Design a protein around this ligand. Structure first.
Ligand code: 70A
Ligand code: CA
Lengths: 56, 251
């Protein structure tokens, strides 16, 4: 059950699979990077990001 | 908010101000372009359901700077388990009549998945609470949006550190300080308790209840949003129903 330990290394969501398998996922407005852990915005105003701080 | 600071304009972009007949009622949290999460108790005394307004991009109540967006509240959804005048299940899901437009000053807070919130976010010690509530107990409310960083306690520790109060249930959590220096107040009710994790902010709590404001021996009590994720998600997939107030089964 990899997800209970340090979020399974996921930046956002973590799903446990049969065996030593884990899939990271992201909120809508983000895509998962090829590292399989990181979430990158796909939209101009993704949730939980503060534009005036992001643009700084 | 007692003992916090002004939230610099645009740094709390998911904060919602709820108005009834143009008067300050409660706060709320924008979670996408059409949905706002607030506290069920904010609606106990409403008679004029058609005069409920949500304002996004608000900062200073004394001036209109053009970043404000006002929307009529089309629906207020409350869990069937909430009892008016009490504390448990203090959550409301509000559907705006028209979506807000996302801008640098209007951005949703992430509503997290339950597992992520219970396994990870629940262990992030400090989170931000905000609103235009009382600056002092029995004092004036704020003209500029205020924000405060508060630590979360395990419920066993909240009970031990507190000095005829209602029970702290599994649908709640304590956060704040027992030395009377810092707290959210009644005017902040419904506002966000926002938690940062790996570069993103998430909704973990709703300003709910307590005794006075920043009173010695008492912490602030917040609705434990993780218990409502499935409930909120199912409702957001639902079609609107005539009438503003809707009681929906919980779980
Ligand atoms: C649920 C609840 C809320 C509150 C006090 C008690 C209760 C329960 C026990 C009884 O239930 C109630 O008292 N219910 C209730 C229903 C409607 C209203 C509203 C109102 N009433 N008149 N103008 N506005 C907001 C609608 C109101 C309370 C006003 N009010 C005292 C509240 O909001 C207050 N909020 C906080 C929120 C956060 C607090 C914090 N961290 N540290 C200290 C105190 C705090 C008080
Ligand atoms: Ca303004």
């Amino acid at each position: 059950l990899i997800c209970v330990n340090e979020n399974g290394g996921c930046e956002q969501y973590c799903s446990d699979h049969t065996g030593t398998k884990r899939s990271c996922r992201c909120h809508e407005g983000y895509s998962l990077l090829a590292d399989g852990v990181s979430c990158t915005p796909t939209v101009e105003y993704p949730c939980g990001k503060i534009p005036i701080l992001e643009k700084r | 908010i007692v003992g916090g600071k002004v939230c610099p304009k645009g740094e709390c972009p998911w904060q919602v101000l709820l108005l009834v007949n143009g008067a300050q009622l409660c706060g709320g949290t924008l979670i996408n372009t059409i949905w706002v999460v607030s506290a069920a108790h904010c609606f106990d005394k409403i008679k004029n359901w058609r005069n409920l307004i949500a304002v996004l991009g608000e900062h200073d109540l004394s001036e209109h700077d053009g970043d404000e967006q006002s929307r009529r509240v089309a629906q207020v959804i409350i869990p069937s388990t909430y009892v008016p005048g009490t504390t448990n299940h203090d959550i409301a899901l509000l559907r705006l009549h028209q979506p807000v437009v996302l801008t640098d000053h209007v951005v949703p807070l992430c509503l997290p998945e339950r597992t992520f919130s219970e396994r990870t976010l629940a262990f992030v010690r400090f989170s931000l609470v905000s609103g235009w509530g009382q600056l002092l107990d029995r004092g004036a409310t704020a003209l500029e949006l205020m924000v405060l960083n508060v630590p979360r306690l395990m419920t066993q520790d909240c009970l031990q550190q507190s000095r005829d109060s209602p029970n702290i249930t599994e649908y709640m959590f304590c956060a704040g300080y027992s030395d009377g220096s810092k707290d959210s107040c009644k005017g902040d009710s419904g506002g966000p308790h926002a938690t940062h994790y790996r570069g993103t902010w998430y909704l973990t709590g709703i300003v709910s209840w307590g005794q006075g404001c920043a009173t010695v021996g008492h912490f602030g009590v917040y609705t434990r949003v993780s218990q409502y994720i499935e409930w909120l998600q199912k409702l957001m997939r639902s079609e609107p129903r005539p009438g503003v107030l809707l009681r929906a089964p919980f779980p």
